[PDB]
Amino acid sequence: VLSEGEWQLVLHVWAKVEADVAGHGQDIEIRLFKSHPETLEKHDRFKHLKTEAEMKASEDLKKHGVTVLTALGAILKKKGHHEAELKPLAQSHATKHKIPIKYLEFISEAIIHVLHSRHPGDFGADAQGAMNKALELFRKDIAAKYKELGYQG
Ligand code: HEM
Ligand SMILES: [C-]#N
Ligand SMILES: [Cu+2]
């Protein structure tokens, strides 16, 4: 569980993210597709995009990023009482996209990386630590939902 102070740090940095959701989205996907190459395989409209400028020029990928970071953002803003919008997400990533928790760890890693890259001044130790707790909670709860729909990845 997070303290109110931690939630404030999470949402402080997220409002910075919201100055440019689209560019953070691109950075986050490109970083994740590159540090953990198994991940880009799940997206099959994007795997004819074999270089960074190709990734950044794809409006499809960009829209996708916005969609993703918009869902994440709405989750973080509920400060843990996120069952209602976590449920549709687990339904898709568990029974269609089949994304294991490990992959959710890898994208959580990329998010943290991009946040530190773009917002050092706003992403110091306590802020990193709070964002990690928030993403950790998200993965705990989505894992529980995953199992309720079956599939223990
Ligand atoms: C912070 C965790 C993430 C969030 C908030 C997120 C959110 C979303 C959203 C909102 C959509 C569009 C609607 C839907 O089908 O659910 C989506 C689609 C998708 N996501 Fe995720 N996602 C997460 C992580 C992942 C990762 C780690 C994988 C890949 C390793 C992945 C792969 C997919 C795929 C394959 C689609 C379908 C794309 C389509 O054809 O539009 N997601 N995601
Ligand atoms: C979803 N990425
Ligand atoms: Cu994606």
Backbone angles phi, psi at 58, to 5 degrees: -75, 110
Inter-residue contact 29 to 64 (CB < 8 Å): yes
Determine contact, residues 87/95, Cβ cutoff 8 Å: no
For ligand 1, is residue 95 a contact (CB within 6 Å)? no
Proximal ligand: closest to the CA of 107: 1
User: Does 130 sit in the ligand 1 pocket, CB within 6 Å?
Assistant: no
Measured distance CA(152)–CA(94) in Å, rounded: 9
Experimental method: X-ray
How far are the Cα atoms of 8, 74, 95 from residue 33, in angstroms, in the given order? 30, 24, 22
User: In this structure, which CATH number among 3.40.50.880, 1.10.490.10, 3.40.50.300, 3.30.70.20 belongs to the domain 1-153?
Assistant: 1.10.490.10
Determine phi and psi for 106, rounding to 5 degrees.
-60, -40
- For residue 116, say whether it is annotated as part of any ligand binding site: no
What does each C-alpha distance from 117 to 28, 42, 56, 77, 89 come to in angstroms?
Answer: 11, 26, 17, 22, 27
Task: Please give the Cα distance from 99 to 96 (Å, whole number).
Answer: 9
Hey, what amino acid is at 61?
L
Contact 146, 153 (CB under 8 A): yes
Residue nearest to atom 10 of ligand 1 (CA): 68
Q: How far apart are CA 150 and CA 48, in angstroms?
A: 32
Ligand in nearest proximity to the CA of 141: 1
Mutate to test the pocket of ligand 1, among 68, 108, 146 (most ligand atoms within 8 A of CB): 68
> Is 64 annotated among the ligand-binding residues?
yes
Ligand 1 probe mutation, 27, 66, 93, 141, most atoms within 8 A of CB: 93
Domains in the chain: boundaries:
1-153
CB 75 within 8 A of CB 138: yes
Q: Give the chain as a 3 state SS string.
A: CCCHHHHHHHHHHHHHHHHHHHHHHHHHHHHHHHHCHHHHHCCCCCCCCCCHHHHHHCHHHHHHHHHHHHHHHHHHHCCCCCHHHHHHHHHHHHHCCCCCHHHHHHHHHHHHHHHHHHCHHHCCHHHHHHHHHHHHHHHHHHHHHHHHCCCCC
Number of Cβ within a 10 Å radius of residue 72:
22
